[model samples]
Target chain A: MKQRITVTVDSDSYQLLKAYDVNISGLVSTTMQNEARRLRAERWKVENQEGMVEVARFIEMNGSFADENKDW
Target chain B: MKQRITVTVDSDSYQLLKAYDVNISGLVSTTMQNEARRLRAERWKVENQEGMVEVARFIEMNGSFADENKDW
Candidate 1:
């Protein structure tokens, strides 16, 4: 359900976080989660935007054919 | 020296890569490396830009005291 990773950080940053007693692993995991979410969203947005544009163009060319065929 | 992680990809993308027999782990690792490098570089750029500006302002005000001091 979980995994471990070894990450290299600058010595000063490492020491600063360690001095603050921060949950480094948790911090990293959460940051990665956010980054991944953002990255995925960006990809999804781009793909979907293109797809939606295509769909709109199709609809413009042939209006509402899906409703004409109820099998969909 | 290495760690294992379980990553969740979209089912379709997962199957597509699986069908291609790609090295999924290596791909993810390399992508993460690139992303991490970009993230770190962005952070470094912002921090360094701010620090450099502050140092420039300090030198403008103090006229490079460190060279005058020579002990530093």
Candidate 2:
């Protein structure tokens, strides 16, 4: 699936990348896509905050049991 | 304030943008930075969950979103 989005960028930066034979849109697409991938976890947490808070409130009432264990 | 980053993008995309007078890096940098601007808001909400949940609990023990003004 692919989509195009209009983005605002500095003119000088545009020329600089062009100097290197760059695909403005493609590079932007891939780079932005890659970055979006990195941020999805953040996306998930925010979207899921509703549920997280519910559980947190549940915990506030019920308390937690995990000992914060780690073997690594 | 500026920073340089090395990014991996498809060679074709790079060439395509380069084919134009587009500032590939400049475009990419500006585009990417602009994108980062958006995800940062999500970043804040996620980071602020600690406080949000705190308030939720306070309300969880207390009430609703201005429901007192409404009558059944």
Candidate 3:
């Protein structure tokens, strides 16, 4: 069941959101979930630093597959 | 400048908040700010782990001043 909760936001953003008929709930929900995901991803990176280092060395020696497909 | 934005939440929590006349904006603002603070604190700890370790050892040797008044 959905409940309407009031949130405080920037006045300009609110006007912009209203102009676009933005679904704040959906937007905030997705945004907050992504926030947690980003944070957890950082934690995972820390926890798996050893594994990441191994992969880093592997990629360094083998070169990435995308190396040839790109112009920097 | 504050604007009211709508968010969706669990109905049960909504009722509980309402029962206490919760100022959701204040609650959410504080809560969100603290979330950022906590994450930033974690990042700080990671960045200063060596320094913190020194402090941790200092604390261990001296013990905390708060230990002086324990179990009164």
Candidate 4:
């Protein structure tokens, strides 16, 4: 079951959203979820530094693959 | 009338979104709108350096106020 909730947005941001016919709920939901995961990953890296140096070296040598195969 | 569109999301992200009972359309709508605005603002800052130096200095001295008065 879906529950309706109210959110307070910046006035200008809200206005900009009003100009689009996009799905605001899905956008916010996905964005929030993704952001939460991103933060969690960052926290994990900070807390679990055992192999971080190796990981950093690997990334430095091979470059971060985050942009690989990205179409956006 | 609103038009329907399709988006290709990462498999994990799609699954994560499916776990929520949130309105996907609205969330996507607002996120895209806000993201577009954010990009535009960044581009503006890069292309127009008229007040950016002062702006950067002001932020450095006062710190970014993004967290101030934030209820989220």
Please write out the lDDT profile of model 3 over residues A2-28, one tens digit for every residue. 777667554223333332334444444
Off by over 4 Å in 1: A1-72, B8-12, B41-72
User: lDDT of candidate 4 vs native?
Assistant: 0.39
Q: What does candidate 3's lDDT look like per residue over B1-72, in tens digits?
A: 576766666533433443333343344433333342353213434354465435555422333222133475
Query: How much lDDT does candidate 1 score?
Result: 0.34
Question: How do the candidates rank by TM-score, highest first?
Answer: 3, 4, 2, 1
DockQ (Cα-based) per candidate?
Answer: 0.03, 0.05, 0.18, 0.06
The per-residue C-alpha lDDT of model 1 at residue B65 equals 22
List model 4's recovered fraction of native interface contacts, to 2 decimals: 0.09
Query: Which TM-score value belongs to model 2?
Result: 0.27
The sequence of per-residue lDDT tens digits that candidate 1 reaches over residues B1-72 is 233333344322432332333333333333343443353223434343456434455422423222122355
Q: TM-score of A-chain in each prediction?
A: 0.40, 0.39, 0.36, 0.37
- lDDT of model 2, residue B25: 58
Cα deviation at A2, candidate 2, in Å, is: 7.3
- For model 4, how does the per-residue alpha-carbon lDDT over A1-72 read when each residue is reduced to its tens digit? 233333444322333443333355445545757743432211111122243523423433322232221123
Candidate numbers, best DockQ first, in rank order: 3, 4, 2, 1
